[PDB]
């Protein structure tokens, strides 16, 4: 005889269709970035400004718990930490705070 057929594999890959769910398939590719690398990386060739135990308020005012800037710097974004509480040690209101943060990013 002579037949005409197609390929089959030992692949476990399952996909969904509009007419039937969980169809097992020979070859597939992912469209969904599900994983991240867990590290702060450089953006546009620049490293972020890392404020540490300080926030922008504390850093730009010279809160004594903030590390002072040594050289001229560039940065592509600003990184704060969940425990960056050191801002205005003498209490009061910081005018247009959010605006300044956005403009310094």
């Amino acid at each position: 005889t002579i037949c005409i057929g197609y390929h089959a594999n030992n692949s476990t890959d399952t996909v969904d269709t509009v007419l039937e769910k969980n169809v097992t398939v020979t070859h597939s590719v992912n469209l969904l970035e599900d994983s991240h690398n867990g590290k702060l990386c450089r953006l546009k060739g620049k490293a972020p400004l890392q404020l540490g135990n300080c926030n922008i308020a504390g850093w730009v005012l010279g809160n004594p718990e903030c590390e002072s800037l040594l050289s001229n710097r560039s940065w592509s974004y600003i990184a704060e930490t969940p425990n960056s509480e050191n801002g205005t040690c003498y209490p009061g209101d910081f005018a247009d705070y959010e605006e300044l943060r956005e403009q310094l990013s």
């Binding site: 002579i2 005409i4 057929g5 197609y6 390929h7 089959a8 269709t17 469209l31």
Partner: protein
């Protein structure tokens, strides 16, 4: 069509070389052959299709975050509304695009084998019993010199 998983039931595991082809029992090699055109035109088309779902989305530099003070709740909510809006649109349009174009891809293989099967039945005519399984009993069981020429689709009478 009804070629894939219709009258050609299941599939073959023995084709390490391609996606479509033939299985011949005559007087020699019982192996399988790939159709380097029926297949290398599909991969030329599928990789073209994935690469355009991937790369047709150009996206600019964007910092999504916005920070608002306690007397700016309205802005905060307007901003959240915009983020929820896009999320809802891209989530719905992506999930369905994947769903629909997957069926469009599985049909592509139906239309391909059905045309490859019709590339030999509309060529061999009444020189074989047209078994419904997707297979043809040969009247002069071609040797390996002839069978390798039906791949190119070339016969005589």
């Amino acid at each position: 069509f009804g070629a894939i998983a219709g009258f050609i039931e299941g599939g073959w595991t023995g084709m390490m070389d391609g996606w479509y082809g033939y299985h011949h029992q005559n007087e020699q090699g019982s192996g399988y052959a790939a159709d380097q055109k029926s297949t290398q035109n599909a991969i030329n088309g599928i990789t073209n299709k994935v690469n355009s779902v991937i790369e047709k989305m150009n996206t600019q530099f964007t910092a999504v975050g916005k920070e608002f003070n306690k007397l700016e709740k309205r802005m905060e909510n307007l901003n959240k509304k915009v983020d929820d809006g896009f999320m809802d649109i891209w989530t719905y349009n992506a999930e369905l695009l994947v769903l629909l174009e997957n069926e469009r891809t599985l049909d592509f293989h139906d239309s391909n084998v059905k045309n490859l099967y019709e590339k030999v039945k509309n060529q061999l005519r009444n020189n074989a019993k047209e078994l419904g399984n997707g297979c043809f009993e040969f009247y002069h069981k071609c040797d390996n010199e002839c069978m390798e020429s039906v791949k190119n689709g070339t016969y005589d009478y």
